[PDB]
Amino acid sequence: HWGYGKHNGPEHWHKDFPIAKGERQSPVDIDTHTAKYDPSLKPLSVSYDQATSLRILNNGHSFKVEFDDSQDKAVLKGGPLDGTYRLTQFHFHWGSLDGQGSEHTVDKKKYAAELHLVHWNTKYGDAGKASQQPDGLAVLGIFLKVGSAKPGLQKVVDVLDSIKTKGKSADFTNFDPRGLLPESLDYWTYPGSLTTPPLNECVTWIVLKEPISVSSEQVLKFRKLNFNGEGEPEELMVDNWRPAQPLKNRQIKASFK
Ligand SMILES: CCCSc1c(F)c(F)c(S(N)(=O)=O)c(F)c1F
Ligand SMILES: CCCSc1c(F)c(F)c(S(N)(=O)=O)c(F)c1F
């Protein structure tokens, strides 16, 4: 199985998923000085008022909150996107210590963690079929820095003890993902990929400029999770991030400055 260790981590993924060495892999370093301000980009429209979270689970590579995406309830549009994308899940990537954890970097800076709110293009009817298309998914990426607590994250942090090992899950209703957003929706965008196997090149990335702050106690709880299933050797779930990949011919566009 793929993972993040020395023997099954990012440098090994290309042997099962050759698109790892593709032309539009993610994440990337965002060079804020070469990114092109595009005055034609729209404001992002984040419409999460009717979101319905359902469950939270530890899948062995992160923890994920899944939403009811069977109706048009929590949708992303505007910005660089054509059409309408529906929120299906969010998850995080984070480090073994505060100076690393994010997948995207900004001028080579790593953040403590990165939140991925994952949406699929409604013209493809559902998430799996969307992941097979070059404009199938839109992932809103938000950086986490350690400082003051994010009140809206606490409901997530407080349930993680119940999903410590791979395969555990719990009901998780009435979680409002609006409480995980920073004030500004200024963003960078570029065409890329899933950052884990199968690494499909199906993602329009929209990475917010403004990080959210979370507390040390909040991120500490992420680090208590385990990659392993209950009954296997204990390997804390930390450093579940893919390093920056070559930008190749791509431009990163900015909605601002
Ligand atoms: C302890 C030995 C691990 S076996 C293995 C592996 F090495 C990989 F690199 C992969 S990969 N190419 O998906 O990382 C894999 F799926 C594996 F099962
Ligand atoms: C087939 C799509 C389901 S798999 C998946 C995913 F949904 C992501 F959001 C990501 S991410 N980490 O790019 O947001 C990912 F890497 C995945 F592999």
Ligand SMILES: [Zn+2]
């Ligand atoms: Zn992710």
